[PDB]
Amino acid sequence: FIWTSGRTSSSYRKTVTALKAGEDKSIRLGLFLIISGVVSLFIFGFCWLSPALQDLQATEANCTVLSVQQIGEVFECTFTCGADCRGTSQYPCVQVYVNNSESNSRALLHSDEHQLLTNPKCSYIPPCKRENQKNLESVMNWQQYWKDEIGSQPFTCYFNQHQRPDDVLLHRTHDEIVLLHCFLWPLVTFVVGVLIVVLTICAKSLAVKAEAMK
Amino acid sequence: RKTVTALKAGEDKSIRLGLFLIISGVVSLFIFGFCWLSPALQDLQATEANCTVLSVQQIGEVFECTFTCGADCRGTSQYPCVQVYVNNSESNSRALLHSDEHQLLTNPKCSYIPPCKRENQKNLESVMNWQQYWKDEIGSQPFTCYFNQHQRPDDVLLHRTHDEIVLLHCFLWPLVTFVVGVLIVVLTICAKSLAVKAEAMK
Amino acid sequence: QRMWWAFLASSMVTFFGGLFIILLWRTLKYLWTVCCVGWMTSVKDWAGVMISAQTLTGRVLVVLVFALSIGALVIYFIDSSNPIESCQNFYKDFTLQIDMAFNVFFLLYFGLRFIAANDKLWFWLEVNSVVDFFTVPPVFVSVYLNRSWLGLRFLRALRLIQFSEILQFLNILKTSNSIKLVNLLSIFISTWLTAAGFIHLVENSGDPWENFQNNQALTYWECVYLLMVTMSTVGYGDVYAKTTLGRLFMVFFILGGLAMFASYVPEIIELIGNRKKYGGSYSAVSGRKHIVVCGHIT
Amino acid sequence: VFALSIGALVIYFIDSSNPIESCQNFYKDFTLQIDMAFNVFFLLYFGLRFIAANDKLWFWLEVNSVVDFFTVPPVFVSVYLNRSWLGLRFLRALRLIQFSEILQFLNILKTSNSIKLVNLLSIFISTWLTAAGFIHLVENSGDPWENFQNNQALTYWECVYLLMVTMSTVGYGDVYAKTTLGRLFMVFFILGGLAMFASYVPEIIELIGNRKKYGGSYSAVSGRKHIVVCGHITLESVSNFLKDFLHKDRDDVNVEIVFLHNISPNLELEALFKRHFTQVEFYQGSVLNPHDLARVKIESADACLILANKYCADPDAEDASNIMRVISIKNYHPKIRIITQMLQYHNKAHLLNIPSWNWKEGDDAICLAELKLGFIAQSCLAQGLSTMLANLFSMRSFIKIEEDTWQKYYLEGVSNEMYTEYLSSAFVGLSFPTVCELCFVKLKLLMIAIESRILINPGNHL
Amino acid sequence: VNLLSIFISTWLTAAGFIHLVENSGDPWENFQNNQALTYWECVYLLMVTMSTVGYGDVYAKTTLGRLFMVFFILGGLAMFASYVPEIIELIGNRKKYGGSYSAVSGRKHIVVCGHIT
Ligand SMILES: CC(C)CCC[C@@H](C)[C@H]1CC[C@H]2[C@@H]3CC=C4C[C@@H](O)CC[C@]4(C)[C@H]3CC[C@]12C
Ligand SMILES: CC(C)CCC[C@@H](C)[C@H]1CC[C@H]2[C@@H]3CC=C4C[C@@H](O)CC[C@]4(C)[C@H]3CC[C@]12C
Ligand SMILES: CC(C)CCC[C@@H](C)[C@H]1CC[C@H]2[C@@H]3CC=C4C[C@@H](O)CC[C@]4(C)[C@H]3CC[C@]12C
Ligand SMILES: [Ca+2]
Ligand SMILES: [K+]
Ligand SMILES: [K+]
Ligand SMILES: [K+]
Ligand SMILES: [K+]
Numbered sequence A: 001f002i003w004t005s006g007r008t009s010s011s012y013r014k015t016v017t018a019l020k021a022g023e024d025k026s027i028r029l030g031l032f033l034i035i036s037g038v039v040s041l042f043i044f045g046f047c048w049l050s051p052a053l054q055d056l057q058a059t060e061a062n063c064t065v066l067s068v069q070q071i072g073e074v075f076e077c078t079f080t081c082g083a084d085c086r087g088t089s090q091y092p093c094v095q096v097y098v099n100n101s102e103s104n105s106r107a108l109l110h111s112d113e114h115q116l117l118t119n120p121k122c123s124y125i126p127p128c129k130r131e132n133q134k135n136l137e138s139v140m141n142w143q144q145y146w147k148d149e150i151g152s153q154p155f156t157c158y159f160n161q162h163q164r165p166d167d168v169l170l171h172r173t174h175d176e177i178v179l180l181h182c183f184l185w186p187l188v189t190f191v192v193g194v195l196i197v198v199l200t201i202c203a204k205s206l207a208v209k210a211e212a213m214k
Numbered sequence B: 001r002k003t004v005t006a007l008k009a010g011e012d013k014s015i016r017l018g019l020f021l022i023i024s025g026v027v028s029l030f031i032f033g034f035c036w037l038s039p040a041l042q043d044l045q046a047t048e049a050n051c052t053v054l055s056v057q058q059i060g061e062v063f064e065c066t067f068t069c070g071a072d073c074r075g076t077s078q079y080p081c082v083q084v085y086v087n088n089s090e091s092n093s094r095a096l097l098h099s100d101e102h103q104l105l106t107n108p109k110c111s112y113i114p115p116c117k118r119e120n121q122k123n124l125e126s127v128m129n130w131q132q133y134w135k136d137e138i139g140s141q142p143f144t145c146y147f148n149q150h151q152r153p154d155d156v157l158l159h160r161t162h163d164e165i166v167l168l169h170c171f172l173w174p175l176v177t178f179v180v181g182v183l184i185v186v187l188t189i190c191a192k193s194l195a196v197k198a199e200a201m202k
Numbered sequence C: 001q002r003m004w005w006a007f008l009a010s011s012m013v014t015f016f017g018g019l020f021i022i023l024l025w026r027t028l029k030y031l032w033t034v035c036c037v038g039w040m041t042s043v044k045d046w047a048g049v050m051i052s053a054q055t056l057t058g059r060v061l062v063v064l065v066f067a068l069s070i071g072a073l074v075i076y077f078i079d080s081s082n083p084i085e086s087c088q089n090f091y092k093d094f095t096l097q098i099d100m101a102f103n104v105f106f107l108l109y110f111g112l113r114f115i116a117a118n119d120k121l122w123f124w125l126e127v128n129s130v131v132d133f134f135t136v137p138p139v140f141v142s143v144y145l146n147r148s149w150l151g152l153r154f155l156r157a158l159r160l161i162q163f164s165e166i167l168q169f170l171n172i173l174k175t176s177n178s179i180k181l182v183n184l185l186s187i188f189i190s191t192w193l194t195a196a197g198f199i200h201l202v203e204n205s206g207d208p209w210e211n212f213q214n215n216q217a218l219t220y221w222e223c224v225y226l227l228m229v230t231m232s233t234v235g236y237g238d239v240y241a242k243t244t245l246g247r248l249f250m251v252f253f254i255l256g257g258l259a260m261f262a263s264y265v266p267e268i269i270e271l272i273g274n275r276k277k278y279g280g281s282y283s284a285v286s287g288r289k290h291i292v293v294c295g296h297i298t
Numbered sequence D: 001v002f003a004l005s006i007g008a009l010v011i012y013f014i015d016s017s018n019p020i021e022s023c024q025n026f027y028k029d030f031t032l033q034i035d036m037a038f039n040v041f042f043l044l045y046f047g048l049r050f051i052a053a054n055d056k057l058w059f060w061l062e063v064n065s066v067v068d069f070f071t072v073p074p075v076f077v078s079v080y081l082n083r084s085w086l087g088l089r090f091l092r093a094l095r096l097i098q099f100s101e102i103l104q105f106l107n108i109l110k111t112s113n114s115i116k117l118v119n120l121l122s123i124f125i126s127t128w129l130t131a132a133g134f135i136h137l138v139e140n141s142g143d144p145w146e147n148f149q150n151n152q153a154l155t156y157w158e159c160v161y162l163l164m165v166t167m168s169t170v171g172y173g174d175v176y177a178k179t180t181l182g183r184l185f186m187v188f189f190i191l192g193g194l195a196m197f198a199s200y201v202p203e204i205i206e207l208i209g210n211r212k213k214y215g216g217s218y219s220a221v222s223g224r225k226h227i228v229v230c231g232h233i234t235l236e237s238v239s240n241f242l243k244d245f246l247h248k249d250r251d252d253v254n255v256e257i258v259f260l261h262n263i264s265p266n267l268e269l270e271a272l273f274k275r276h277f278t279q280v281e282f283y284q285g286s287v288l289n290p291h292d293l294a295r296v297k298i299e300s301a302d303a304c305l306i307l308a309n310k311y312c313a314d315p316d317a318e319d320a321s322n323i324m325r326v327i328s329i330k331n332y333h334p335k336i337r338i339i340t341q342m343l344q345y346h347n348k349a350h351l352l353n354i355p356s357w358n359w360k361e362g363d364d365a366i367c368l369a370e371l372k373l374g375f376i377a378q379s380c381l382a383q384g385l386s387t388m389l390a391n392l393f394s395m396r397s398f399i400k401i402e403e404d405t406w407q408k409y410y411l412e413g414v415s416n417e418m419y420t421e422y423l424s425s426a427f428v429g430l431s432f433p434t435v436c437e438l439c440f441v442k443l444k445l446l447m448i449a450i451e452s453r454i455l456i457n458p459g460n461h462l
Numbered sequence E: 001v002n003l004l005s006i007f008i009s010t011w012l013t014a015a016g017f018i019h020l021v022e023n024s025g026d027p028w029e030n031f032q033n034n035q036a037l038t039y040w041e042c043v044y045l046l047m048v049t050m051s052t053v054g055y056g057d058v059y060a061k062t063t064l065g066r067l068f069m070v071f072f073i074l075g076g077l078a079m080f081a082s083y084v085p086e087i088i089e090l091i092g093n094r095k096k097y098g099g100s101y102s103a104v105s106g107r108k109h110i111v112v113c114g115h116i117t
């Protein structure tokens, strides 16, 4: 068939009873779980490597706001309405600038790395709630709550002089729990695979002793 | 005749290798020759000239540059457009200056582009800085320029976009591959034929 | 709060706790030697007769299994059109009551096959036992929790593997060609549907390292179509997997699914269409004589 | 060597996630120290293979020498320069080619099928990974005539996925090479990689899954007898045997039937065994193998039945094969009851000289030619008696139809078989004719004979 | 040599024809739907089409180009499917056990022949 066409012609002691077959299938399973657990550990390790280093390279700092302002420009958010319905609405842009613990110089605040990447030109984005008036109201609400925060309390912040060279975050975007589960359950798979092999060999060898006893 | 021992197999493998390097070098020479042909002719067809600026001005319109921030992060920022017009040695008529062929092709409507550095204010500051440095260059010194009446019919460049060194390496190392392939065949045949003379000597 | 892990945990705990209990019973049976026809056989024989179609009740049970496998598959097909996780009232959800009853019947059929089994550990590792551990416990958990997750419910399609066996039990399939055709069709369809369900689960729930943000909203039938396009090697590219796990699954399926398609589709098409062109019989005409010629015809 | 090849491959996989060229401190980079040590070990292993080599020039041109020249020197240069380039490091994946050879050295791989499977897997995976690394290098570093501006940011795993899609001929088009060198490489790989995939993937899938379905051994059940059947086993032979053995006119016997044959049963025999699922078991083996004889538990079987090929081309060859089977069974267990079919009578005489052949204990050689010629001779004393005798053995139910035809009467007569059982103390002390006229229609039973042992139709004096 | 010559000449000729047809549009469309395809781009497209990979990044867009593509798909795939395995079988027919024994001074050797299994 689709492999070439026409394949170009044709181009190609046993004292234990039946229990032996079930026990050899149990060895197979336990070995396959050992391999699965190790392979999945490496697969998840390669997938988590870049996110985990990009997170580790960002240090904790103490921050204080230098200023809060609007740049007068506006941007599109997308608002949603069931099945696939979406349209766009404007929001006004705030910028916020902040004191920094590693560079001791100006940097622009970005609430989280998704906000930084969805609009790196701007400091905050409202959840899009239909009309422009509600976006502007929600930006003005956040703006007023940030503008009076002057040295009130040095809030902790996250920074990376190598890849966020003048940008600052309020949150870690890397959930430790999700990473923990991604490395724990492959380890559980491996441990269960070892115990299945061990109990199968323990049962198999005790069957011979219980046979020779008779 | 088969007086040679096991060494025959290593020497025939050495002939194979030397022949494969000869073929590789010739084939890669033709492959690189077809790839360099259009760039090298588009470069050769552009003559050197002496230029002088007629005027420096802004067209009032603005354009997007893209600014970058790690992994894949990019956004866009405006820059104001300058145009610059220049005296020409082949057509003796108006042409628009474009700093290099990549600038010409990224925005042919405009004469310069700032490296995008976040906010609009820094782009406008950097355009005003370049503009002021170009506006007072009136006959100060006829700076050399590159032109092609056949494919840049009213457009002029400050630089060659074709690096001679990169082309030189692209044709040199396939030639080295070919010469090494010949020397391997020659030394293998020289060793093979001297082994017969040293055998007959005994 | 989300509960996806409770359904999955109930299946894993069922499969591995049973496996460990069997292996511990074996170990401790021989370890008792350190410290030192029956009714069991009669019930094992009765269960083995019921499992086969040797009695009217056994035939009824086998037909019920055949019908309820398709019923559960259709129930999964209905649910595949809804959101991935949701809250739904058991006392007011006819499909959840029907699924509850179907899984009761499958639990009973599992219990009968366990009693009839010769080597328990061999039975625990028979794949239609595995299909029951990965499809029966999560229905019980859902009916208890008054919530559902569309998790490993696509494994219901693996129930089609036993169709040829239970047709042979019912004295329906006798010829080798028909048996082979049914086997090939069952294996092809069950593999296709199961693989489509798994890629549907993986595409609709994104990558954990990407924080589940790169999920692709793919319907189950869209995934079925994508799998068919991929198996046949057409590869349109209009629909394709985008998540890392989806592509990792696609790479492993490309090795197996193309060899299955390339082997099974020609063989199925050869098995069908084996009709005799020259059959039938001559129809005599009144008033006209006819002559029969035989022997050396060339 | 086996471990460190995988270690170096994993190190390359780690590095493939970083930028193409970078500066990194050797004294503070555990992966660069580990790579340094791994390449020291490979340099030593290279030196040993060079010393062991017979023709040096042949060794210098062996491809795992070439793989060391293209992977060891650049590690040394990197450790000296305190910098790394992800250049030709994908050639580390070619180290998997020697895995089968070093497994054969370790006395692990012996069978041809396993050796071929390992070779195919190693060649496929190493080719795939190496080609993926090369296309990754070429795509991430653009064309020199385009001044390296048309580069495509492709990850190594993205290139691996693209290569798999291309090899299988699926060609999604979501990911593809865009540079001129990348496409030129794609064109040459399409010629070789598709022929490799189309050839190796079916052959690997054939090599795997070669499992014996009918393995294992019979498990005896306490309180229930079992019977081992061997010799000429085929769909019609088993179907005819099971119709007579399991007939409803016998009493409630629960004797299990175990078949031993060296040919895997076809789909129609497997269906026949499934229709008898609780009474028939089959095990694939040779009757001449004591291991198989122990598997079918022939040491505890009630008897062993040996069916014969009555329509064989060579009766002498068939008789010899049956004689060998009897010899093997008796050699394994002298005290096993053996019932066999013998085509000729001289071969029956040959067989009865076996030291363990005990006709008193119950060894019956059913000679076909003898019994058929005896039945023909009894038809010469009374015509129809061959039919009369033959119908007394085959188990047959009553069949009745409304038509008044000779067939109705014939079938009514055919419904009777010959049986054997012990008879009441209420008939002890009477004459044989008297108990016959008593049994005839009151009990509805006819007696031909009684247990000076076997007496055919006793006189009135007994 | 015959297979290689026929394969390469067929490939290059077909690529040139599809290059001509794509760069000069359809007369009923007044030559306005022409696609600027280079000769090497057409060669790559033909290879992708012959092997049945079908990326879709490059494809014919003119009516004549597609009409040519349809007729080439019938012939070019049968040529590729037949010739590429046969060429790969013809190459690589090397004898693994060639060469000759090299005697070692001070050590004796024994030659064994006949029934070897
Ligand atoms: C008898 C055996 C097979 C049962 C299988 C184990 C299953 C049923 C067990 C394992 C973990 C358990 C869950 C653990 C946590 C919770 C959350 C709680 O708010 C309700 C109970 C619930 C939801 C449990 C339900 C039963 C559960 C899912
Ligand atoms: C259902 C799960 C959760 C528990 C399994 C029950 C286990 C522990 C018990 C119940 C009955 C037991 C079986 C009873 C009879 C036999 C036959 C003997 O020749 C092998 C052991 C075996 C097969 C026993 C193994 C252990 C066993 C299967
Ligand atoms: C490692 C690189 C840099 C140098 C290699 C060493 C060179 C100079 C020397 C050292 C050992 C030498 C080999 C020693 C023994 C033999 C066997 C003889 O019958 C033919 C010459 C031959 C095959 C020699 C060839 C040249 C040789 C390989
Ligand atoms: Ca009767
Ligand atoms: K294809
Ligand atoms: K395709
Ligand atoms: K395609
Ligand atoms: K495509």
Ligand SMILES: [Mg+2]
Pocket: D277, D278, D279, D280, D281
């Ligand atoms: Mg049984």
